[PDB]
A paper describes a structure:
Tyrosine kinase signaling is tightly controlled by negative feedback inhibitors including suppressors of cytokine signaling (SOCS). SOCS assemble as SH2 domain substrate recognition modules in ElonginB/C-cullin ubiquitin ligases. The SOCS family members SOCS4–SOCS7 were originally identified by their conserved SOCS box, an adaptor motif comprising three helices that associates substrate binding domains, such as the SOCS SH2 domain, ankryin, and WD40 repeats, with the ubiquitin ligase components ElonginC and ElonginB (Hilton et al., 1998). The SOCS box mediates further assembly with Cul5 and Rbx2 to form a RING-type E3 ubiquitin-ligase (Kamura et al., 1998, 2004).
Human SOCS4 was coexpressed with its binding partners ElonginB and ElonginC in E. coli. The crystal structure of the corresponding SOCS4-ElonginC-ElonginB ternary complex was solved by molecular replacement and was refined to 2.5 Å resolution. Comparison of the SOCS2 (Bullock et al., 2006) and SOCS4 ternary complexes revealed a common tripartite domain structure with an N-terminal extended SH2 subdomain (ESS helix) that stabilizes the central SH2 domain and a C-terminal SOCS box that mediates a conserved four helix bundle interaction with ElonginC. The structure of the SOCS4-ElonginC-ElonginB complex reveals a distinct SOCS structural class. A 14 residue C-terminal extension in SOCS4 prevents these interactions resulting in an alternative domain organization. Interestingly, the SOCS4 ESS helix replaces the SOCS2 C terminus in the domain interface. This is accomplished by rotation of 80° of the SH2 domain with respect to SOCS2 (calculated by using the DynDom server [Hayward and Berendsen, 1998]). Significantly, the SOCS4 hinge has an insertion of R383, which redirects the path of the main chain. The alternative conformation is stabilized by the R383 side chain, which is buried in a hydrophobic pocket between the N-termini of the SH2 domain (βA residues Y287 and W288) and SOCS box (F385 and F387). The function of the SOCS4 C terminus is then redefined to stabilizing a new interface with the N terminus, which packs as an antiparallel β sheet behind the SH2 DE loop. Interestingly, the SOCS4 substrate binding pocket is occupied by residues from the N-terminal tag sequence of a crystallographic neighbor.
Author numbering:
A (entry chain B): 1 to 105
B (entry chain C): 17 to 46, 58 to 112
C (entry chain A): 267 to 429
Amino acid sequence: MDVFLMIRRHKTTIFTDAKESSTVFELKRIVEGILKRPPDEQRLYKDDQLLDDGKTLGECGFTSQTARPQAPATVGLAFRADDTFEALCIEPFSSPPELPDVMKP
Amino acid sequence: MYVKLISSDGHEFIVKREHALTSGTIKAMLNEVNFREIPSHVLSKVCMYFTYKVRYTNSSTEIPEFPIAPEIALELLMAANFLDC
Amino acid sequence: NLYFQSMLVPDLLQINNNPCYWGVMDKYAAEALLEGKPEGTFLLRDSAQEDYLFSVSFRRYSRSLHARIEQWNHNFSFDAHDPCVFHSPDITGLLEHYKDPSACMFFEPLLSTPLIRTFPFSLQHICRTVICNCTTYDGIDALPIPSSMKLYLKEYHYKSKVR
Ligand SMILES: [Cl-]
Ligand code: NA
C-alpha cells in the first residue's frame, strides 16, 4: 500500500511516496538523500504533533484514504540548529483570485 | 531521481524526474527549472497531477477523480496547456 | 429556428467522472476493446463524426455495434426526431435507461456492463470539464483567457435550433 506525501519546510515541498508499513525513520532516510540532513537532525510532524521514529506511517494515520496521489498528506519538517531544533514553520502557498462572475452559482 | 521546480513566488517543489517528465515542456527542457509565470498554488497542484498521471497510467483499478476547485481552474488550465500535460 | 444556439453539454463533468467514458476514440479502437466480449459490454466515447459529440459502442448478437447520440429540444437520444423513442435531458440518464437487459428491445442498445477506462485524461482536459460545469457557453466569452482557449472550452457543445 503506497501512501503519497508532501514533506514541507519553509518554501520547500517534497512530493514522495512510501509504503504504509514503512517507519517514520525510514521516511527521514528518504529526506536525508534529498536534503542532506541526517535523521537525528530532523523532526517530522503531522500537523503540530511530532511523530515517533519507530511507528509506521499507517499507525500515524497516513493511509489509502488519507494520502492519495491526487491529494497527498502533508508531513511537516524542522531541522536542528546547533543543539536546539528550529520551530516548525511552513510558508503557505499563494492565494487564488476572486472567481469570475460567469463562474459563480 | 529528483528535480526541483520553482514557482513564481519562490516555492521550491522537489518531485521525481520520472513524474516531471509527464510534462512535455519539462521533458523537452531537461536539476532545476524556474517558472516565472506559474505561482505556488498552481504548481503544487500540477505536481499532484504528475503523481496521479503516473500512478493511474496502466491502472490496476478504476481511476478516481482529480479534484480541482473552481477558484484555481483557469490558472491551472493555462499552466496545463503551457506545460503540455 | 432558422439559426442555432450553441450550448454546453449539461452533463459534461458527470460524464468525465464516469469510468465507462473513453474520450477521443474511433469505432475501430472500440471494436478492438470490445472484441469477443459478452452481450451488453459497452463504452461511451467521442464520435468521430463532425455533427455528433458522443457514441456508444456495445456488444449484442455477437457483434460490435455502435449508436450515435443525437440531441433535440435539449434532450438526448439515439433517435432525436422520433419522440416515441426514449430521451433524457442528460447523457447520463440516457445510458441509465438502457442498463437493464430483460427490459431492452431488439432494436435498442444494451448497455449493461461498462468497460472501464484504464488511463487518466490530460490535466488540461480535466480543468476544462470543471470550468464548463460552472459556466455557460456565452459565459466562456467573458473569461480572462486567450481565444485559443475559449475555442477549447467550447468544444463540447450541441447546436440548439429550438425555442
Ligand atoms: Cl478527451
Ligand atoms: Na464528434
